[PDB]
């Protein structure tokens, strides 16, 4: 639950929030 | 501008401005000059705001520049009004210098008006101007 | 026509009016003058410090003369002699001559000596009494005893026309000359 | 402009510790002002 | 004008029991916590 | 993915992932070409000393607790805040 | 003090004149300059005291100057 919990929130600032694609 | 105006020395100080630099671009325009050393002379004495001292040093710059006729140091009689000797005080050194170079009539007019209204401005230099030509002259 | 001339003419239009400020100047001025001149001592020491800076300075400029053997060049043999002559009291004369005049120096003795008598003059001047009484710079106290007493107008404590205002009614006006004098060496 | 005599109790009280509000944080080498009369000391050992 | 109370809260995933309790309150709806 | 001493990221991404995560420093007589240089240069048992350390960084708010991976989060809000008032102001 | 004017020539005076000014200006105009790309301000003043700071041309002043 916390491991997923910080990876998510790491995810959403890695790609600003889905606004950026960083697997293309 | 200066047609409509009453108490504007504006308009007179970008007149001689803009004669100032049409005598620079072209050295022969004596009657430029002329007018330039008028249009300041107007507006200092428009000014009495501590701005003329600026427009006194331009005449003094166009004063040393005239010829043997003495085309350009005549704004002086095209000129009707007061002088307000009190913003030429600064500039005493350099009327005592050029009263022996070329223009000492207009100069020795303004030291005998501040002779007469300041004395404590003038004494001690020209004392010591006095001294020196003594010296010189007739060691 | 000749400067002066026109000199002369503003100087007389100026004293015919203010007589009595006009009279109240010149007296202050020519008491300045005359009883704030240098002693003897100080114009000895003035001398031989500039004859050691030009020294130093021609030795910079023109090396290999600092040897034991370069016979002091440039003619300063004039100015050291006329200096000896002219420019000393009877009482340090003898030696000065005794030391300079004499051919013995070259270059090194020469800026040596002047060392010497260098620090002689400073030490000299460095232990005089500093604080000196304002009445005695007179036979009579001119500045001191009767300023406040002998002027016939009121004169303004000088340089205040050289800023930047726009009106004379606030200046300084002279009060008094403080009654003690101090000697300072630069 | 008044000035009252004596003045009231809560203007001549002895100020107390006060903790650092405002979210902005602490300790930051920064050209940022704020200051209270009398902040807490912080926690230490030695 | 408001409050964002959802910044608060997520400082659960980053003395630890005062640290804890805060999210928890603002997430109830405690505002005085 | 591109590997990395102790980061990686993904060929087209901006920024980095730490494997951990989901001269003389601090010296005021460095030279570079943008400062002046400095005159007191030439020109251009562990246990004690951790207790040392430990006293000297006493009060040290943010250090102290330390004796670090940023995430940009208030600049990305900028850009966002920034982005959105310009599109706003583009319909007016 | 050259002693030799002779002319008294207002043209000479004039360019003469002219040409110091500029001198000055541009002096003065150097320094308050601004680089063009991501450098910082004043970078002028910043190589002019390298060059003033530098032991190379400091050993090359009068033993009066005194340069240390």
Same mark, same amino acid.
């Given at each position: 639950q916390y491991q997923l919990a910080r990876l998510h929130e790491q995810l959403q600032a890695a790609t600003n929030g889905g606004r950026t694609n960083i697997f293309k | 501008a200066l047609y409509f105006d009453?108490?504007?020395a504006k308009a007179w100080a970008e007149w001689g401005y803009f004669n100032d630099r049409k005598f620079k671009e072209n050295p022969s325009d004596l009657p430029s000059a002329k007018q330039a050393l008028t249009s300041y002379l107007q507006a200092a004495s428009s000014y009495?705001?501590?701005?003329?001292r600026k427009l006194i040093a331009r005449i003094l710059w166009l004063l040393s520049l005239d010829d043997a006729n003495g085309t350009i140091a005549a704004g002086f009689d095209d000129f009707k009004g007061e002088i307000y000797v009190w913003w030429w005080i600064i500039f005493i050194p350099q009327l005592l210098v050029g009263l022996?170079?070329?223009?000492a009539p207009r100069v020795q007019a303004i030291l005998l008006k501040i002779a007469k209204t300041y004395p404590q401005a003038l004494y001690f230099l020209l004392r010591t101007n006095r001294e020196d030509m003594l010296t010189i002259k007739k060691n | 026509k000749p400067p002066w001339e026109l000199t002369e003419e503003i100087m007389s239009v100026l004293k015919t009016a203010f007589p009595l400020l006009a009279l109240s100047m010149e007296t202050m001025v020519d008491q300045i003058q005359k009883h704030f001149k240098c002693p003897p001592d100080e114009d000895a020491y003035r001398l031989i410090v500039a004859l050691l800076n030009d020294g130093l300075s021609y030795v910079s400029r023109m090396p290999?003369?600092?040897?034991?053997?370069?016979?002091?060049?440039?003619?300063t043999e004039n100015n050291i002699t006329r200096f000896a002559e002219?420019?000393?009291? @009877?009482?340090?004369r003898p030696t000065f001559e005794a030391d300079f005049?004499?051919?013995?120096?070259?270059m090194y003795e020469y800026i040596h000596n002047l060392r010497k008598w260098r620090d002689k003059f400073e030490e000299k001047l460095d232990r005089?009494?500093?604080?000196?009484?304002?009445?005695?710079?007179?036979?009579?106290?001119?500045?001191?005893?009767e300023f406040r007493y002998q002027k016939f107008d009121d004169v303004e404590i000088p340089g205040?026309?050289?800023?930047?205002?726009?009106? @004379?009614?606030?200046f300084i006006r002279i009060d008094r000359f403080l009654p003690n004098v101090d000697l300072v060496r630069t | 402009l008044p000035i009252p005599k004596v003045l009231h109790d809560k203007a001549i009280q002895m100020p107390q510790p006060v903790p650092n509000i #405002? #979210?902005? #944080?602490? #300790?930051?080498?920064?050209y940022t002002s704020g200051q209270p009369a009398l902040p807490k000391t912080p926690a230490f050992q030695l | 004008l408001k409050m964002n109370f959802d910044l608060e809260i997520?400082?659960?995933?980053?003395?630890n029991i005062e640290s804890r309790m805060l999210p928890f309150c603002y997430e109830a709806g405690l505002s005085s916590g | 993915v591109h590997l990395y001493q102790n980061h990686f990221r993904f060929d087209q991404q901006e920024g980095m992932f730490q494997y951990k995560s989901p001269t003389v420093p601090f010296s005021i007589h460095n030279h570079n070409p943008y400062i002046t240089p400095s005159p007191y240069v030439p020109y251009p048992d562990e246990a004690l000393a951790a207790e040392q350390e430990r006293y000297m960084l006493?009060?040290?708010?943010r250090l102290s607790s330390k004796l670090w991976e940023p995430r940009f989060e208030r600049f990305k809000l900028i850009e966002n805040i920034k982005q959105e008032h310009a599109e706003k102001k583009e319909q007016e | 003090n050259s002693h030799r004017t002779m002319s008294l020539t207002e043209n000479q005076l004039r360019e003469t004149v002219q040409a110091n000014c500029d001198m000055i200006v541009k002096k003065a105009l150097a320094l308050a300059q601004t680089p063009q790309?991501?450098?910082?301000?004043?970078q002028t003043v910043t190589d002019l005291i390298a060059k003033a700071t530098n032991p190379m041309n400091l050993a090359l002043c009068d033993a009066l100057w005194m340069p240390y």
């Open positions: - | 009453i108490t504007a009495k705001n501590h701005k003329s022996g170079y070329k223009e | 290999a003369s600092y040897a034991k053997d370069v016979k002091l060049p440039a003619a002219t420019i000393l009291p @009877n009482h340090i005049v004499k051919v013995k120096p070259t005089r009494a500093s604080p000196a009484p304002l009445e005695s710079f007179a036979h009579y106290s001119p500045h001191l005893s205040q026309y050289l800023q930047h205002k726009d009106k @004379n009614q606030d | #405002g #979210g902005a #944080g602490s #300790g930051r080498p920064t | 997520r400082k659960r995933y980053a003395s | 006493t009060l040290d708010e | 790309g991501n450098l910082p301000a004043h």
